[PDB]
Amino acid sequence: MRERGWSQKKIARELKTTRQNVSAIERKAMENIEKSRNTLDFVKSLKSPVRILCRRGDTLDEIIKRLLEESNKEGIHVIHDSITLAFLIREKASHRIVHRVVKSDFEIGVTRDGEIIVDLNS
Numbered sequence: 001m002r003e004r005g006w007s008q009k010k011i012a013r014e015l016k017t018t019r020q021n022v023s024a025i026e027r028k029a030m031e032n033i034e035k036s037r038n039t040l041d042f043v044k045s046l047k048s049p050v051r052i053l054c055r056r057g058d059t060l061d062e063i064i065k066r067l068l069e070e071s072n073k074e075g076i077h078v079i080h081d082s083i084t085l086a087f088l089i090r091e092k093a094s095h096r097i098v099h100r101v102v103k104s105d106f107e108i109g110v111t112r113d114g115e116i117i118v119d120l121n122s
Helices: 012-017 025-030 039-046 057-074 082-092
Strands: 050-054 106-110 116-119
Touching: 012 082, 025 039, 025 082, 039 082, 050 057, 057 082
Parallel strands: none
Antiparallel strands: 050 106, 106 116
């Protein structure tokens, strides 16, 4: 195609560096992934609830650190970006994924992956 979401955006570097036998959707995907490992799958079962707010993309970089504090808090030590989360998630949830806006305040949340919640923060 062209891009794969994390095709060298920003912190993507630190992301690609992150893959402690965890999600590593990048390595796995590129690893002729198809349907064997069952990584994101095994973690998919969890279907744990999560919630994070999105801010001006101009702060996406910083928001990433703030996001982790929200996710990594209830998630596994991961240094992914909001841009990668959408892609990484899309894999574990190609249905309802999270987006990012750079102009106004936004909010995204989920309980498993099916039903999600959105808002403009208040």
